[PDB]
Amino acid sequence: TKKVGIVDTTFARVDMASAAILTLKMESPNIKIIRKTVPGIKDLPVACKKLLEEEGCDIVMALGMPGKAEKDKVCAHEASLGLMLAQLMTNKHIIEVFVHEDEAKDDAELKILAARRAIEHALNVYYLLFKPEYLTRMAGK
Amino acid sequence: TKKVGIVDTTFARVDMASAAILTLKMESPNIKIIRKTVPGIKDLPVACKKLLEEEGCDIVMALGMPGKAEKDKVCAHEASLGLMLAQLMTNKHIIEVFVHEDEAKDDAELKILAARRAIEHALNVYYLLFKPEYLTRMAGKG
Amino acid sequence: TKKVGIVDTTFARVDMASAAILTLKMESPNIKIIRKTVPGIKDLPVACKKLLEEEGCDIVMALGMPGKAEKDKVCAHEASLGLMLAQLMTNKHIIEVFVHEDEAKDDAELKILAARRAIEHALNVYYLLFKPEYLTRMAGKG
Amino acid sequence: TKKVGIVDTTFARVDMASAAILTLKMESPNIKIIRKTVPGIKDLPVACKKLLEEEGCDIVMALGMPGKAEKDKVCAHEASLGLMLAQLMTNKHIIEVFVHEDEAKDDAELKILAARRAIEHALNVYYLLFKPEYLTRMAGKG
Amino acid sequence: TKKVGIVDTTFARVDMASAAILTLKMESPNIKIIRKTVPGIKDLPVACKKLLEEEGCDIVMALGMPGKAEKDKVCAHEASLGLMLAQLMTNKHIIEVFVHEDEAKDDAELKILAARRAIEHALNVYYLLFKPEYLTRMAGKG
Amino acid sequence: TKKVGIVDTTFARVDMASAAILTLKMESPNIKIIRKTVPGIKDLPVACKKLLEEEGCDIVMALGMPGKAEKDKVCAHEASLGLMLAQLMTNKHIIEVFVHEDEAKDDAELKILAARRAIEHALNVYYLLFKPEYLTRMAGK
Amino acid sequence: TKKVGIVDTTFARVDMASAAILTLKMESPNIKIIRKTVPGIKDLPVACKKLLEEEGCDIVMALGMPGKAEKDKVCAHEASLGLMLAQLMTNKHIIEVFVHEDEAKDDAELKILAARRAIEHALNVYYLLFKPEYLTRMAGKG
Amino acid sequence: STINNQLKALKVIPVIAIDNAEDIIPLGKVLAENGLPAAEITFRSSAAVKAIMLLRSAQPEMLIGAGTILNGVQALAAKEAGATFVVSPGFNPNTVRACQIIGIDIVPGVNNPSTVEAALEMGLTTLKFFPAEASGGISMVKSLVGPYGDIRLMPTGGITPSNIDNYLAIPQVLACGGTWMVDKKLVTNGEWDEIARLTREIVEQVNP
Amino acid sequence: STINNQLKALKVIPVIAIDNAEDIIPLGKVLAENGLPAAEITFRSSAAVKAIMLLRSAQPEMLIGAGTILNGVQALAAKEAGATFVVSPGFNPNTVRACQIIGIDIVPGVNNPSTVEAALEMGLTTLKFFPAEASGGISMVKSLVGPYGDIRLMPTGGITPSNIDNYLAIPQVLACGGTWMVDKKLVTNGEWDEIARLTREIVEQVNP
Amino acid sequence: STINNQLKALKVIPVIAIDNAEDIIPLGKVLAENGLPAAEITFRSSAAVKAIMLLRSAQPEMLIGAGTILNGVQALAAKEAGATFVVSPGFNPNTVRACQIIGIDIVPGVNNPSTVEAALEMGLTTLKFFPAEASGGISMVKSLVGPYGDIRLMPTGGITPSNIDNYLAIPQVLACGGTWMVDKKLVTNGEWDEIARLTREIVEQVNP
Amino acid sequence: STINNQLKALKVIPVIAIDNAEDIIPLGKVLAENGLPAAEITFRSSAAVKAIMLLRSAQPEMLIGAGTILNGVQALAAKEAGATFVVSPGFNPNTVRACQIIGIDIVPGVNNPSTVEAALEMGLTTLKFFPAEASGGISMVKSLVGPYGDIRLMPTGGITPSNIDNYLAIPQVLACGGTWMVDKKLVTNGEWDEIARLTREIVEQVNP
Amino acid sequence: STINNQLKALKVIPVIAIDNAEDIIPLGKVLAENGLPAAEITFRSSAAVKAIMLLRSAQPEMLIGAGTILNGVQALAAKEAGATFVVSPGFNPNTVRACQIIGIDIVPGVNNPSTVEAALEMGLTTLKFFPAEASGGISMVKSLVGPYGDIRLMPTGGITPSNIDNYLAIPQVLACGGTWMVDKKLVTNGEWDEIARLTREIVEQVNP
């Protein structure tokens, strides 16, 4: 009865969507899923907004991986405000799942880190959709 | 007859909501209260806006605790503009209660600081809701 | 009341109808009875169906006596399917009372066997019409 | 709810209905059961059809026990086509549960065999009614 | 725009459906498939008919594997007429895919034979649905 | 047909419901029966009244077993007036079947006494429902 | 879906309501509870009746503790008839929970006895509301 | 089927007329320990119901029937007390119907062909033949079982050790009812040794 | 209540794994005539069903249970064959519910406090304690019966004449299941004299 | 987790089976003045509750739990009497909820990996390990705490001064339950000095 | 059954608790070149996920499972890292359900009849038997496989070269899990020569 | 990716034309035990489907492909028989499309630049180069791999021990197909020793 949109990119170097999809289907047996892939992180905001407005998603996960340069840093900041603005226009959450490449020490770690961050955030969506009170408890923690 | 929304997070390391709730109930015997908790500080703006628009809150307290890194600094700046934009879209105050972790020298101080900032801001809400004149009087004070 | 049709033949070598008629009148004195006689066993199915559909019978007894040859065997098989098909078209039982001539060792036995089979099937009709529960009980034995 | 019809006979030498009834009530507590007993195996097809059409059964179990002679063999074949025809007229399954007397080596075995076949088929009804996917899995299964 | 129903059993000892499904999807990519599994071969006719009448299938493949005994032989004959009758009631083809166990010399052959039959018949469905003429051209073909 | 309500308790130490039910089914081939069990004897009056008013019973049997103390004696008196008041509000008989524990000399007697009293009263219901004249003929006993 | 009224007194020397409330919430997660406290046991009947009639309670627990004198004995008798009359006027159960002070040998016992009687009766309410059949089963139970 | 088998094994059923219900306890002990774990307790005395209840408690595996059952009310009393079958001196189809409805088996008394046919028509086949001697004895028994191959009889009335063998020699006779080993006089006088002797003697006689 | 009483009297229940169903006839004869008229026939194979049927025909008064009952279908097979109770090695509430619905008593296996509580919650009090030795033996039994005053146990698994007395000394133990006197090896080899000896010996040991 | 801190300090919790509730007063006095201000009062007698009420009045700062709590009704009785937590021999999720609903702390018993996982799933981390010796002792304890880093255990069952040190040496063991210093025999016989001696001795042993 | 066939061939599965994930590379090299190309990597730490990823890269044909899997999130982490099955110390049907949904095989731990039946009911037949020695060892294993002909076991917990043969002698035992040849102490100390010898020794022992 | 790695390791793939399917069993045994656990079974005859099925049963870990696959029907037959890839002598995009739909990998044959580009456009990179010698041999191979850096080749046709090294010396050549060690003449004549010799010799030659 609840619909989630997942927006990811071709730019990213780890597939983050599959693990998030698996998590939510595991948590909810029948929750509806819709996927759109865009080229880059700056293409995320509108794709996210269309999924909320034109595909009737209750919530969206926006998945991206900023590069290492101080210019990819600016791209992600730009992309993050976009995500916030899309949320405020539609009165709906977009959970931003950005894994910067600078956070891992090799590729094995980055595959690990991106998959884990995706999964947990997928769990966060579950709670936001179904069990807000549980979220309320974790306050402070 | 007046309702307040309080939005906090699981990310924060001190429970800021309980003390703010206690403060307002203490100042106003019957003021209503509604709580939503979100995961992070970037999830604050929309939750705040929905409480103002869909739960009929007159005002909201947005409670968060930015981390220490220059990246949590950017997250909070992002979250602060969001809060401002949510206020301008709805013609309603959101009192931002952000306690950066860099402001305290240990955890004992941070628990203290966050609770105190929350309480005071809770008092500020009371005045904004009920006693603006006191505020006008106080303009130009520490 | 309950109406029973009885269809028999001129081919048969023992009158099976009289004993079946006597049985049912004995068990249910006011029962309505209607009789049609056809030449052969292959003429049984339609006569049976018309009695069910056009004479308002609740049930029919179809009485016949297949001969001895492997060709009368085929005639009876043909006649039996016909009986089943007539039942399925009308949602009504036809109790098939076929006494093959091969089952008795002389004519005295065949007169005896045909009359007895007719009577007991006549009793089965009464149960089907009036007392299904008794039938339900007899499922075990035989 | 879901409704099942069970049709058995007085001819049969083992009560097959009780075990099938017990199985289904065990599998699903809610299910409705309706029973009709007929004299013989050739009386099964119409009783089955009436239960499907006039008593609103979703499915029927047709329980019978053909005798040993090559003439009871013909009766069962006749009765089996009837069952198939009743199914095709009503767009509803009739699960045929026939236990020939030739399949057991004494009466103890026949009581055992008939009861077991009935139970399993009762389980098959459950799946057909409630869990067709499980059935799909067993494809190519022994 | 074209729909096919596939009905198979749990009785069968080789999964015939997967290969038929794969064949048809390979020949046509805009073809809809619906599957129902029944316990036995005698349950095939009504499942086939419901798929044609209630699930809007243009055609059905009926897949089964008769056993070895002269009694499974009778079951399949019964099941084949049923299939023909279901076709004549609905003005729609049911392609019968029966692989008797007697046709293979071991299990490896039977897996092979059943899969191959299934596939070819799946190709026959394609032609019946889309390419009637190719079929016409095969008249008199070995 | 005619419907009878039977109200009994968990407090009682002998099942009296089985004894009458059997009696009435024996006397009447198809008379209907409805049962409600309440905890105590003070819960009998309203259950009895609801059966008369909301379940369409023509008559009710109220079955109970007062204990031995002078306080169970008061409970039963309270319960008996209740029964009478329920009868007067609905213009329908409630046959009171109370077996005090003080009336039997051991448990074997009490099982016997309670079952017999129940049965006889069940016979009295039959007559009240079907054969009043037989009561009148038995003017003197 | 269900609703219960609990009426107690200030006269009583043990709080009986809390344990009864805890019991019912434990057995039914979602049950609605409404409480009224009156001064004495003679004030119980009307408070009970108003809860049944004006607050839409399905059932009421009437909790009281008669004193020791032969005059409190008369008060409780008076109060018990009142309870019965309130039940007969509204066609709804009032479970009387009276714990006389004479039943315990000290105050520790009386706290124990009153709390236990309250809880047991709270369980009786659960059954009356949700599971009458259990009660029916325990007929003749000690 | 269970009752028939138990009767066939016992061959003799004590028919008991008790005055004081308490007396059933020592009586039952003596019967059971001397090889005769059966009793038909007659509804003549007010205490028979209590006697059945006491006996069932004291001798749980005893075959206990109630006799002189003239109506369904008494049949119910007997069932609730713990009897597993009832017996009537004659055949009253109203009583038989009532027993069917309340759910206890009845073995009704007959003494002529017409009453046998009445019982058969109600589905009964195990019948008491009473009063056995006064109705013509073994000659009568042979005349009933002859035409009616399905019946099985329990002759009672005037049966003694001197004539019981003749009745038991008839295949369709299951057992005979006898009062002599439990005569009220013996019970009233506490002649337990004599009751034990009569019981052992008859058990040895019929089941040698 | 009947089963509890029979177990308490028997004290030892033969747990039988039969290969050829026909073998149940001489086995049952030897058990019954040596004082042990009871048998739990394990559903190792579909063949046992026949064993229960043959045994019930041959020894009508024998206490016959079916063991290794893992589902309601098997419980039904056992009921139809003539068993009067079923036993499972562990506790499956789905099996217990199925037995309640089909109407046969079940004595399920437990071996720890949590499983005992699960059984109690479903209204069961007679439980099999299995595997008895491997789960901690008498020390474990004492730990279960201690907190749970309502339970009655049938320890099975590793019970032998050398340790059975210790189990029977616990008041809440009704009887123990044992395979040693009916070991498949003895049956397969037709060692009827040995089976008779083991049976007499254990009967004398537990019921001196 | 307040309970955890008190248990960690005490290291040994007297598990009390009282016959006469009044006996809890001198028993509690002896426990408290000898350095062991804790008691788990088992619901093995109707009296235990009165015992909790008397003990809470007499020794207000005593840590008082109720044991053998099999259902929410008993948990409520214990709460109303003044216990601050309940304990059960095994793990019944129905009991655990009920305790959550009525608002009292429950430390349920477990003895294997599956039951631990069941408890963890309901948000519990402090668990009783029972029966400790009969379930495999320290070897079993090490096998549970190993995979489950979040659990904290209270081993009970067969704990004595000769084996308690081995259990306490495991970091995730908070305290052990023991009956030996409050054995019913000692209480029944008014052996107060010995109880005092056993209590002083164990306190010195575990908290040297 | 692919999972089984590999286990049946290996007979012994190293159960690995790694501190530094990098250590899995030399450890896996030593295991594989000494004839034991299998590893169950326990989720003691986050290091486990990286260890599975490194091992799968370094030893692509290695049988790699993840152990101590308590929930579906961890099962997913293990699947994404490259494990082909997960193992849990006990049986949590919620975990089993999650593994079915995310699509990875689970071999859950059991140690008694009830938990076996719970697993069978969810369609599982290959089960870990844990903790093997502390739960009663080979005597317990024989008691489980006996009633449950469909199960296949992987005993783990206290398995050593001195007792593994006894477990492997049971037909329904596929393989045993063992830590001794990969003990953290040996890995921490870089005792690669000793790990190799232990690995060679056990391979020779079980697959002579 | 798996197939590429297996080919790179093997370096030579037996291309088998079998007359009697049964012959695949001894042939596969000889190939596998002499170090060459791979086979491409050509659909030269109807007998091959059975050959793939028999070989997969007899040598489960063998790399088994089907050759001479001219259409999707044959590709399906091969998949159902147990082959994990198919090979075609030339490139038919309709066949490639069908293989994608039925879900089996195909390695199609090419012998010129245009056909390579056709394959690349359909997403294929591992291609058979056939007939290798008749199409220009190593000079042709060098001309294809030169412009097309992504392709990897399996040259087949006229490959012998005298020329295979020259092909394998080209980095983009994964392996070559060869019939000489499995020539039908040798199989027909049961020359198993010679097949074993040819197999050992080529394995030593390419993987020294």
**Residues with Cβ < 8 Å from J188, sequence gap 6 or more?**
J19
Q: In this complex, which of L54, L77, L103 lies closest to E116 when CB atoms are compared?
A: L77
Q: Of I50, I79, C136, whose CA–CA distance to D17 is shortest?
A: C136
Put simply, whether I120 touches J (Cβ < 8 Å) is yes
- Chain G contacts of F47, Cβ < 8 Å? 93
- Could you give the strand order of the β-sheet that contains I85-88, starting from the edge strand earlier in sequence? I152-155, I126-129, I105-110, I85-88, I63-67, I38-42, I12-16, I176-178
DSSP string, chain K: -HHHHHHHHH-EEEEE--SSGGGHHHHHHHHHHTT--EEEEETTSTHHHHHHHHHHHHSTTSEEEEE---SHHHHHHHHHHT-SEEEESS--HHHHHHHHHHT-EEEEEE-SHHHHHHHHHTT--EEEE-STTTTTHHHHHHHHHTT-TT-EEEEBSS--TTTHHHHHTSTTB--EEE-GGG-HHHHHTT-HHHHHHHHHHHHHHH--
For the record, the structure tokens of E22 come out as 């794969």
**Count of A-B CB contacts under 8 Å:** 67
How many CA atoms, within 13 angstroms, populate the side-chain half-sphere of residue C71? 0
The one-letter code for the residue type at I103 is G
User: What resolution in angstroms does the PDB record give?
Assistant: 3.7
Distance CA I177, CA I164 (A): 10
Tell me the residues of chain G between 83 and 112 that have a Cβ less than 8 Å away from chain F.
84-85, 87-88, 91-93, 95-96
Put simply, whether H98 touches F (Cβ < 8 Å) is yes
With left for phi above 0 and alpha for psi between -120 and 50, is residue L107 left, alpha or beta? beta
Put simply, whether I148 touches J (Cβ < 8 Å) is yes
Distance CA F44, CA C99 (A): 67
Query: At G33, is the secondary structure helix, strand, or coil?
Result: strand
In chain B the beta strands, taken as DSSP E runs, fall at 3-9, 32-38, 59-64, 94-98
C-alpha distance from residue I48 to each of I27, I69, I188 (Å): 13, 12, 15
- Chain G contacts of F48, Cβ < 8 Å? none
Distance CA C45, CA C7 (A): 9
For the record, the structure tokens of K207 come out as 């697959």
Find the DSSP H helices in I68-112.
72-81, 93-102
Distance CA H82, CA G22 (A): 45
Strand partners, K59: none
Mutate to test the interface with I, among K91, K111, K117 (most CBs of I within 10 A): K117
For residue L203, what is the domain's CATH number? 3.20.20.70
Q: If you search the block for the tokens 């394609």, which residue do you land on?
A: E126
Neighbouring chains to B with at least 3 Cβ pairs closer than 8 Å: A
**Count of D-I CB contacts under 8 Å:** 37
* Pairing outcome for strands H126-129 and H105-110: parallel
Closest CA of chain I from D12, distance in Å? 17
C-alpha distance from residue G44 to each of A25, F19, F74 (Å): 55, 38, 19
The verdict on a CB contact (< 8 Å) between I117 and J158 is no
How many CA atoms, within 13 angstroms, populate the side-chain half-sphere of residue I156? 30
Closest CA of chain E from L101, distance in Å? 5
Put simply, whether D46 touches C (Cβ < 8 Å) is yes
Q: In this complex, which of F23, F26, F112 lies closest to H53 when CB atoms are compared?
A: F112
Q: Of F93, F66, F91, F78, whose CA–CA distance to F5 is shortest?
A: F93
Q: In this complex, which of G22, G29, G111 lies closest to J76 when CB atoms are compared?
A: G22
Q: If you search the block for the tokens 């794709």, which residue do you land on?
A: A47
In this structure, are residues I73 and I93 in contact, taking their beta carbons and an 8 Å threshold?
no
Mutate to test the interface with G, among J24, J41, J46, J73 (most CBs of G within 10 A): J73
What are residue H136's phi and psi, to 5 degrees?
A: 120, 0
Closest CA of chain F from G82, distance in Å? 10
- Chain J contacts of K91, Cβ < 8 Å? 113-114, 117
For F78, name the nearest residue in chain G, comparing CA atoms only: G81
C-alpha distance from residue H34 to each of H15, H198, H201, H202 (Å): 16, 9, 9, 10
Q: What angle do CA C9, C15, C18 make, to 5 degrees?
A: 110
Mutate to test the interface with K, among J92, J110, J114 (most CBs of K within 10 A): J114
Closest CA of chain J from G82, distance in Å? 30
DSSP string, F19-63: HHHHHHHHHSSS-EEEEEEESSGGGHHHHHHHHHHHS--SEEEEE
Radius of gyration for the alpha carbons in chain E, expressed in angstroms and rounded = 15
Put simply, whether I53 touches D (Cβ < 8 Å) is yes
- Chain I contacts of D23, Cβ < 8 Å? 72-73, 76, 102
Q: Report the number of distinct structural domains present in chain H.
A: 1
Put simply, whether H81 touches F (Cβ < 8 Å) is yes
Tell me whether residue H128 is one of the annotated catalytic residues. yes
- By what technique were these coordinates determined? X-ray
Contact residues, chain E to chain L, C-beta under 8 Å? 19, 22-23, 25-26, 29, 108-109, 111-112, 115-116, 119, 123
Structural domains in chain C, sorted by start? 1-142 (3.40.50.960)
**Count of E-L CB contacts under 8 Å:** 36
* Full 3-state SS string of L122-186: CCCCEEEECCCCCCCHHHHHHHHHCCCCCCEEEEECCCCCCCHHHHHCCCCECCEEECHHHCHHH
How many CA atoms, within 13 angstroms, populate the side-chain half-sphere of residue J95? 29
For C123, name the nearest residue in chain D, comparing CA atoms only: D39
In chain D the beta strands, taken as DSSP E runs, fall at 3-9, 32-38, 59-64, 94-98
Is the alpha carbon torsion for J171, J173, J175, J181 positive or negative?
Answer: negative
Q: Using CA atoms in the order I57, I59, I60, I66, what is the torsion angle rounded to 10 degrees? A: -80
Distance CA H12, CA H160 (A): 10
In this structure, are residues C51 and C23 in contact, taking their beta carbons and an 8 Å threshold?
no
Strand partners, E31: E2
Q: Of H84, H82, H101, H91, whose CA–CA distance to H124 is shortest?
A: H91
Closest CA of chain F from H133, distance in Å? 35
CA D138 and chain centroid, separation: 20
In this structure, are residues F82 and G82 in contact, taking their beta carbons and an 8 Å threshold?
no
* Pairing outcome for strands G3-9 and G32-38: parallel
**Residues with Cβ < 8 Å from L21, sequence gap 6 or more?**
L47, L48, L50, L51, L54
Distance CA J134, CA J112 (A): 12
For the record, the structure tokens of E63 come out as 């897949």
Closest CA of chain I from K58, distance in Å? 43
For the record, the structure tokens of K71 come out as 């929930």
Put simply, whether I22 touches D (Cβ < 8 Å) is no
Structural domain including I44 reads: 1-208
For D117, name the nearest residue in chain I, comparing CA atoms only: I77
How many CA atoms, within 13 angstroms, populate the side-chain half-sphere of residue D107? 7
In this structure, are residues F98 and F80 in contact, taking their beta carbons and an 8 Å threshold?
yes
Extract long-range pairs of K95-99: CB within 8 Å, 24+ residues apart. Answer: K95/J117, K95/K69, K95/K70, K95/K71, K96/K122, K96/K124, K97/K72, K97/K122, K98/A26, K98/K71, K98/K72, K99/K72, K99/K75
Residues of I catalogued as catalytic: 40, 128
Distance CA L61, CA L28 (A): 11
In this structure, are residues H176 and H154 in contact, taking their beta carbons and an 8 Å threshold?
yes
Other residues' Cβ atoms within 10 Å of the Cβ of residue A130: 13
Distance CA L186, CA I183 (A): 59
In this structure, are residues A139 and B11 in contact, taking their beta carbons and an 8 Å threshold?
no
Other residues' Cβ atoms within 10 Å of the Cβ of residue H4: 15
Strand partners, A94: A60
For E16, name the nearest residue in chain L, comparing CA atoms only: L80
Strand partners, K65: K40, K85
CA C38 and chain centroid, separation: 13
In this structure, are residues F105 and F9 in contact, taking their beta carbons and an 8 Å threshold?
no
Other residues' Cβ atoms within 10 Å of the Cβ of residue L176: 29
**Does L113 sit behind a cis peptide bond, omega within 30 degrees of 0 on the bond before it?**
no
Q: Of K147, K6, K4, K15, whose CA–CA distance to K88 is shortest?
A: K15
In this structure, are residues K70 and K106 in contact, taking their beta carbons and an 8 Å threshold?
no
Q: What's the longest Cα–Cα distance across chain D?
A: 42
Distance CA H125, CA H108 (A): 10
Q: In this complex, which of I111, I118, I133 lies closest to K113 when CB atoms are compared?
A: I111
Q: Of J8, J85, J81, whose CA–CA distance to J51 is shortest?
A: J81
